[PDB]
Enzyme design. Structure first.
Site, PDB file in Angstrom:
ATOM      1  CG  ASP A  75       1.005  16.259  11.862  1.00  0.00           C
ATOM      2  OD1 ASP A  75       1.154  17.380  11.319  1.00  0.00           O
ATOM      3  OD2 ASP A  75       1.462  15.207  11.387  1.00  0.00           O
ATOM      4  CE  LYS A  82       0.583   2.451  11.487  1.00  0.00           C
ATOM      5  NZ  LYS A  82      -0.122   3.708  11.900  1.00  0.00           N
ATOM      6  N   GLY A  84       8.015   3.016   8.504  1.00  0.00           N
ATOM      7  CA  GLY A  84       7.900   1.630   8.089  1.00  0.00           C
ATOM      8  C   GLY A  84       7.189   1.499   6.756  1.00  0.00           C
ATOM      9  CG  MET A  85       6.020  -1.436   3.473  1.00  0.00           C
ATOM     10  SD  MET A  85       6.867  -2.991   3.141  1.00  0.00           S
ATOM     11  CE  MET A  85       8.481  -2.659   3.862  1.00  0.00           C
ATOM     12  CD  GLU A 135       9.236   2.971   3.234  1.00  0.00           C
ATOM     13  OE1 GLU A 135       9.404   4.163   2.900  1.00  0.00           O
ATOM     14  OE2 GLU A 135       9.915   2.414   4.123  1.00  0.00           O
ATOM     15  N   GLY A 136       7.240   5.214   3.519  1.00  0.00           N
ATOM     16  CA  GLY A 136       7.478   6.545   4.047  1.00  0.00           C
ATOM     17  C   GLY A 136       8.030   6.597   5.457  1.00  0.00           C
ATOM     18  CB  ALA A 137      10.275   7.711   7.241  1.00  0.00           C
ATOM     19  CB  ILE A 154      -0.982   0.008   1.194  1.00  0.00           C
ATOM     20  CG1 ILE A 154      -1.955  -1.164   1.083  1.00  0.00           C
ATOM     21  CG2 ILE A 154      -1.736   1.324   1.267  1.00  0.00           C
ATOM     22  CD1 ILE A 154      -3.145  -1.059   2.010  1.00  0.00           C
TER      23      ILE A 154
END
Ligand SMILES: CN(CCN1C[C@H](CCCNC(=N)N)N(CCCC2CCCCC2)C1=N)CCn1ccnc1N
Ligand SMILES: NC1=NC[C@H](Cc2ccccc2)N1
Length: 342
Positions: free
Chosen positions: A140, A45, A28-29, A24-26, A22
């Site tokens: 956030d 996740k 994890g995944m 990623e992005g620091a 689906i």
């Protein structure tokens, strides 16, 4: 033997099969999967935070908050997968309801009807009412942290930057460093606020409402001080009343140094928008945090009257650290995830 996905290990035991990449992005995944016990597809996740103390701090905060909250408009944790021992624990897998999209992806490609804007906004505020009632700040809120399924149910996620509210300790100096996403930052963040009051979340929701109305961010600043200049370009110069509230001289004198700017009317910026939506937008994007509408008042606003029902807008049963070396942080994550072990 362990399950692999596009080259990396993603072993979520025998319970979760048919993984599908689906993102990623620091952080994890992420992969979708099939929950053989409930036989629904879920989202999983993978988090690998233990190599950095900041990642463990945000991981622990998200886990502790999401395990305690229970609310239809806040993503839950269905399951946590990890090794049986702290020595063997290198990753943690968080299992959550499978959501088909998020508001960020949706705004990139789809125009929203006024009925959709109204309903999405209602659910955001309904979830925020519960969060704030727990004395928690999200800090956030932005479209990518708002998940949506195929029937337009909305769920707030990503509490890694959350804090317990602390208004008496909110003051700081001018241009003080900050972490949350720039485009959704309230003006007082750049001026004199650490972001420890509930009004910083309301500002973010106002930015999200503007974006739902136009499909583009209302304050797309390219850097810290550029952010404040975008806000002032639309809201106009702060009034004497609002400036008398800013007692830090560096911040006050910065504002005094700027040429006078008049307010840009909302109906010029959003000529197709419901006028009731623009009246609420105006109240959420109020410069002075003390005059800014609060979540319970926003729910009661005429724009939301077809949904507003305080008896069906629940609050938390109880109100709800950051100095720990990563090893006791890993120990704390291990303890907090123990309830999901067989
Ligand atoms: C014509 N109605 C709006 C239509 N609705 C929606 C709502 C049910 C939504 C379910 N939502 C959910 N999450 N389950 N409901 C019953 C809720 C009572 C209200 C009114 C009295 C004060 C407490 C809230 C309505 N009558 C206007 C009402 N009205 C008059 C003055 N101010 C307002 N809002
Ligand atoms: N109350 C209420 N339950 C379902 C329905 C959801 C919806 C979705 C898009 C636009 C309008 C309404 N509305």
């Amino acid at each position: 033997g362990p399950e692999m996905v596009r080259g990396q290990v993603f072993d979520v035991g025998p319970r979760y099969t048919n993984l599908s990449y689906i993102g990623e992005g620091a952080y994890g995944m992420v992969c979708s999967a099939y929950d053989n016990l409930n036989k629904v597809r879920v989202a999983i996740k993978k988090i690998s935070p233990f190599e950095h103390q900041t990642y463990c701090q945000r991981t622990l905060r998200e886990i502790k908050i999401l395990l305690r909250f229970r609310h239809e408009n806040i993503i839950g944790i269905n399951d946590i997968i990890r090794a049986p021992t702290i020595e063997q624990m290198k990753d943690v897998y968080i299992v959550q309801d499978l959501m088909e999209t998020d508001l960020y992806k949706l705004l990139k490609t789809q125009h929203l009807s006024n009925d959709h804007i109204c309903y999405f906004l209602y659910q955001i505020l309904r979830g925020l009412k519960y969060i704030h009632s727990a004395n928690v700040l999200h800090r956030d809120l932005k479209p990518s942290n708002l998940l949506l399924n195929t029937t337009c149910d909305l769920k707030i996620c990503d509490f890694g930057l959350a804090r317990v509210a602390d208004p008496d300790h909110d003051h700081t100096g001018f241009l003080t460093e900050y972490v949350a996403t720039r485009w959704y930052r309230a003006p007082e963040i750049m001026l004199n606020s650490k972001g420890y009051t509930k009004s910083i979340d309301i500002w973010s929701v106002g930015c999200i409402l503007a974006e739902m109305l136009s499909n583009r961010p209302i304050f797309p600043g390219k850097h810290y001080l550029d952010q404040l200049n975008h806000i002032l370009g639309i809201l106009g110069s702060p009034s004497q009343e609002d400036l008398n509230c800013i007692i830090n001289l560096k911040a006050r004198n910065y504002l005094l140094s700027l040429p006078h700017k008049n307010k840009v009317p909302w109906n010029r910026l959003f000529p197709n928008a419901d006028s009731k939506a623009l009246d609420l937008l105006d109240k959420m994007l109020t410069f002075n945090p003390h005059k800014r509408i609060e979540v319970e008042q926003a729910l009661a606003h005429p724009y939301l009257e077809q949904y507003y029902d305080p008896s069906d807008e629940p609050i938390a049963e109880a109100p709800f650290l950051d100095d720990l070396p990563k090893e006791k942080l890993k120990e704390l994550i291990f303890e907090e995830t123990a309830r999901f072990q067989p």
